[PDB]
Amino acid sequence: NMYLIIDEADIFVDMLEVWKQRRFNLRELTSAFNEHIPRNGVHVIDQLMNDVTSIAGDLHFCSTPAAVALFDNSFNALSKVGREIKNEAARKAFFDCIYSWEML
Amino acid sequence: RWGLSGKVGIGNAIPDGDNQWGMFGGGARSIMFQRDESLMEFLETDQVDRLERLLEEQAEASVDISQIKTEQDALKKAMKSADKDTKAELQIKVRELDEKIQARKDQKQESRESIRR
Amino acid sequence: MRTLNFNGKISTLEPLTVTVKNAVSTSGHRLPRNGGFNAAPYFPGTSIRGTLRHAAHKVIVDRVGLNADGKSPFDLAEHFMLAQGVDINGEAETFAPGEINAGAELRSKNPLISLFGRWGLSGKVGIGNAIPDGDNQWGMFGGGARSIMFQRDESLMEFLETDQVDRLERLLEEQAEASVDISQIKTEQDALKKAMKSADKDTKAELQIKVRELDEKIQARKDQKQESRESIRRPIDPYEAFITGAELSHRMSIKNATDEEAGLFISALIRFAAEPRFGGHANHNCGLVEAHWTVTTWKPGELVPVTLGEIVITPNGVEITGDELFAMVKAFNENQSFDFTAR
RNA sequence: UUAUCGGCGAGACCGGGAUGCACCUCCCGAAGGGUCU
DNA sequence: CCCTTCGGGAGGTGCATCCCGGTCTCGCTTGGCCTCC
DNA sequence: GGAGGCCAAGATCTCAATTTCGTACAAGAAATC
What we know:
Radius of gyration of chain B: 23 Å
Shape of chain A: globular
Structural class of chain A: mainly alpha
Oligomer: part of a larger assembly
Order of helices and strands of chain B: HHH
Distance between the termini of chain A: 35 Å
Helix content of chain B: 40-55%
Order of helices and strands of chain A: HHHHH
Number of strands of chain B: 0
Strand content of chain A: under 5%
Distance between the termini of chain B: 43 Å
Number of strands of chain A: 0
Largest sheet of chain B: none
Largest sheet of chain A: none
Radius of gyration of chain A: 17 Å
């Protein structure tokens, strides 16, 4: 029934190039697993949370070499935490989540 | 020696097990006279006056150095969220703050250094 | 006449370091990076090759044997040929036609030269780079500070005469004055280079010769100092080395190796295992290695290699596995028909 | 567009040698204490 | 509730190779000669 | 014996040599799957 007028489609695409993103929010992942929480690993998540702010700065997306290197390193340093979740079902859910992130 | 190879190589000491390292020392130097009052009885009244002017000047230097460091670390947060090549001017500013701190130190007569540190 | 691949790992018992001119910069001693600036560092295959070549040279020297006084028959030119492959007499021609078929006899009678070639003769041995397996397996070590002996320990002052304590006082005052001078001139030089950053391309050269003027003035304030040329007290900049226990994958090939050449190579491995020191920093005992190699051979036309055996070098000993490695070592030991005094 | 349409092609190992290493103690100063069946 | 220390001294030199070895062609007709129809 | 095909011969000549390098940021809105 509806028709679509995307006024200012130039900015639409330009920021679509941002919207082509899924924010793996470590605070959200920290908040998501609040019962199966290997709290010792939080430091790693906290250290990575610092690094993102250092590379990302004030940008929602930043193309310095650090960003992809930190992306791989963060998920490897999260794979370290992957062997810390105690509940096996939660561990596999976490493993599958990062695996989906890893393959994506 | 310089240019003569030394036959001896003294390797590094590598711990065997995990852990086996941690923070030692610590503590804090203190004012003797709040630790033991008996030393008041050896010091002459003029030296008691000197020690109490030393306490008051050390404590006022402390509080004002402290608020200074507090704005300094809020500025360090600004630097942690500043841009590239704009932080070098804030760093000139920080070095100036530092100089100022060391001058505030200098112009404190004898006890330039915080005692209860 | 078969290809031997030593594929294996070097475990670093002590930190492993090297100083390659291109790798190092104004920062300090830094390992090569295996690519760009931030690439994972690797230990040069050149350092490993040189260490094993000198080990093999010592092996050949011992095998030929030393006269009563302890001297080796080889000429100095022969020592350089065997261990570094430089013809000091300059009689090595690169593409002289007549040596085209003398290469086979030269290799047969000089197994070391066949193994480690020379200028004009291809080396059958290719000693590859050692690349770490894991990440963050390197670091800055050796950071230090030379300190006045008589200020760290005062008991050494009672051993100095009056004129020598006065010498130490003149030296300390010259060091403090030199220091204040070189420090103010370097604290103007560093801001002058922090202005060279935003520089008009032409002005690059002018600020550069200003830097070289300041450097000449630092070197004349150093040539002015009477007591000492270099200040005794100083921080030693650390060097970059692989961490202790780092596992570095290593790959060495002996192309078309005869039994005796591979035997000489294994003897070189053993004699290097006597002193498993790679790279440099012999002070701080850097370079000590525990390396194990799987020797695999590959007959051309075969689809799979055959693992002849394993060469394990540990501080507790050299373990050789496989009958073939023993056979090659024995063949090298028993072949008396080698001549190294003649290239 | 002063006409008409026309593959340029076939072959070559550039390789051969080298330890970058040699010297440095980073140390010196300190009680964190008092407070509550 | 205190209060976070000053500094000191940042190298000296070496040595930067030798040598090869750089192509055929072909843009047209024509007959002489040598084999096949 | 005529008709295809392969190969050698035919006159001298017309002309000119680069010397690597891009590009250097901000924020619009949000019940996100």
